[PDB]
């Protein structure tokens, strides 16, 4: 009931809206509204056929998938969505020229690994257009979460003609994108603080889309957000720190468990030279010197809780006995000032220095600045002779500097792309596109490269955390909001792109 226009906020400028290249939660959420793959997560968090017209035929050994495509699916320029669009985009994803950070997900597809490494041509990838509306996908091995990959933006189709025509400007703004999802993107210049979703009249399932328009603006402090919410300019707003705590008893307060882990990254090599974090004792000193409980109680105050695992609690469970991965792994790198100070003294002796300066990178929101000041406080008071310089940059700049290894240490986070520990653990394999720390442990790589698979993944976390201190988990993220009661059917996805607005609607007045 009433006008079906939804007004939302986002905490950062869009880093990428290229469905192949995007690897961040902001951009992946955008392309999830505007484009669509073979599957998409349903209301219960299960991948369901979307671009696929029916349930695939699957071989006995579960490696060959024969998939019929919707014959009524169209691009926003009227071109039909065909098998060729999937072949093109999956080859694009593995093509070394593209340097797509998620190219490693295509290890699941026959020859994907070899193509990323330049050992085979992209045309050898295990996807074939049998005809214009039929795919044959050949996996490298049985992959239980394959349908979750099919629901992930890197596996969405692309219109080769359009992508080619736009060249290096492809997806740099909303005029340089094509849409096959519930919404079209409008009003995005590439670098501005507003953008718009408009119901796509050429979407095959448009009769289920109820919102005519979704307006998004960048807001980076809860006070501004709250004022906009109270003056009815936005319908949902993020609350952090005291703003969460002051509104936690409000009728419209809601908490979202993101099953995401925020962690400290320790870059071991910058501009070709070892940093101080090449020393394990120094990594351990920083890691163990942060009161994680106080952090969440002081900085977040939003349902977030301390993390002593990379893999979040409550997310993934043993196929044998159904017990949580985190219970089997146990805690790692628990807050301990004395053990931190022991590591600090030993590290400083090994390096032959009395003092160290390092720069801590985080984002440029009000709460990220509070976070950084808290961590600076913790490390400086606990570790004599340590100076921590603060860098607080736009999310996209942090990510660029991460890819370039142009940082010392940083606050980073990962949300799962499918429901298995590997979504987290695979990040820190040697030379991985999401490693970017020059962290390399061959035993860790060997583990990650069925009950046996699970048991080994449990063991891997001990190597990463307790043994090597590659990173330091800080918290398991929840997010607090005020949310107007008239928003109905707001689908929060348990993994992959964060939201699906497709069937969201409003019961205003």
């Amino acid at each position: 009931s009433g006008e079906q226009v939804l007004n939302l906020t986002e905490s950062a400028l869009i880093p990428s809206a290229d469905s192949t290249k995007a690897d961040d939660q902001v951009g992946l959420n955008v392309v999830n509204q505007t484009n669509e793959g073979l599957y998409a997560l349903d209301k219960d968090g299960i991948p369901a056929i979307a671009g696929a017209a029916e349930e695939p035929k699957i071989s006995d050994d579960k490696t060959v998938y024969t998939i019929k495509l919707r014959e009524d699916a169209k691009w926003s320029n009227g071109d039909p969505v065909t098998a060729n669009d999937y072949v093109y985009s999956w080859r694009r994803a593995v093509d070394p020229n593209t340097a797509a950070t998620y190219s490693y997900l295509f290890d699941a597809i026959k020859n994907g690994g070899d193509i990323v490494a330049g050992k085979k041509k992209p045309e050898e990838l295990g996807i074939k257009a049998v005809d214009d509306y039929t795919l044959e996908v050949t996996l490298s091995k049985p992959t239980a979460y394959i349908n979750s990959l099919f629901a992930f933006p890197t596996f969405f189709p692309l219109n080769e003609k359009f992508v080619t025509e736009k060249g290096e400007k492809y997806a740099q703004n909303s005029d340089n994108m094509l849409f096959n999802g519930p919404f079209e993107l409008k009003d995005w210049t590439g670098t501005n603080k507003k953008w718009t979703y408009v119901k796509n009249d050429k979407y095959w399932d448009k009769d289920k889309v109820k919102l005519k328009q979704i307006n998004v603006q960048v807001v980076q402090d809860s006070g501004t957000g709250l004022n906009l919410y109270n003056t009815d300019k936005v319908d949902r707003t993020v609350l952090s720190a005291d703003y969460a705590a002051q509104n936690k008893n409000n009728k419209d307060y809601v908490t979202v468990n993101n099953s995401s882990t925020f962690y400290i990254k320790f870059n071991q090599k910058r501009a070709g030279k070892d940093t101080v974090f090449a020393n394990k004792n120094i990594r351990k000193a920083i890691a163990l010197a942060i009161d994680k409980q106080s952090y969440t109680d002081t900085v977040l105050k939003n349902g977030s809780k301390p993390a002593n695992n990379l893999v979040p609690e409550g997310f993934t469970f043993d196929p044998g006995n159904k017990e949580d991965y985190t219970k089997e792994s146990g805690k790692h790198l628990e807050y301990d000032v004395k053990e931190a100070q022991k590591a600090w003294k030993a590290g400083l002796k090994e390096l032959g220095v009395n003092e160290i300066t390092v720069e801590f990178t985080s984002d440029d929101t009000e709460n990220a600045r509070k976070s950084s000041e808290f961590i600076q406080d913790q490390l400086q008071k606990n570790l004599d002779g340590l100076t921590v310089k603060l860098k607080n940059v736009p999310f996209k700049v942090r990510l660029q500097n991460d890819q370039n290894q142009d940082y010392d240490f940083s606050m980073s986070g990962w949300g799962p792309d499918y429901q298995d520990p590997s979504t987290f653990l695979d990040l820190f394999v040697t030379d991985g596109a999401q490693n970017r720390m020059s962290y390399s442990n061959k035993d860790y790589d060997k583990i990650l490269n069925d009950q046996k698979r699970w048991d080994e993944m449990v063991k891997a976390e001990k190597i990463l955390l307790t043994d090597d201190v590659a990173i330091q988990p800080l918290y398991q993220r929840s997010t607090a909001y005020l949310q107007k009661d008239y928003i109905k059917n707001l689908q929060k996805n348990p993994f992959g792109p964060d939201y699906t607005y497709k069937e969201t609607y409003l019961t205003k007045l």
Partner: peptide
């Protein structure tokens, strides 16, 4: 997916 600190 890489997470932003709100």
């Amino acid at each position: 997916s890489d997470e932003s600190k709100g």
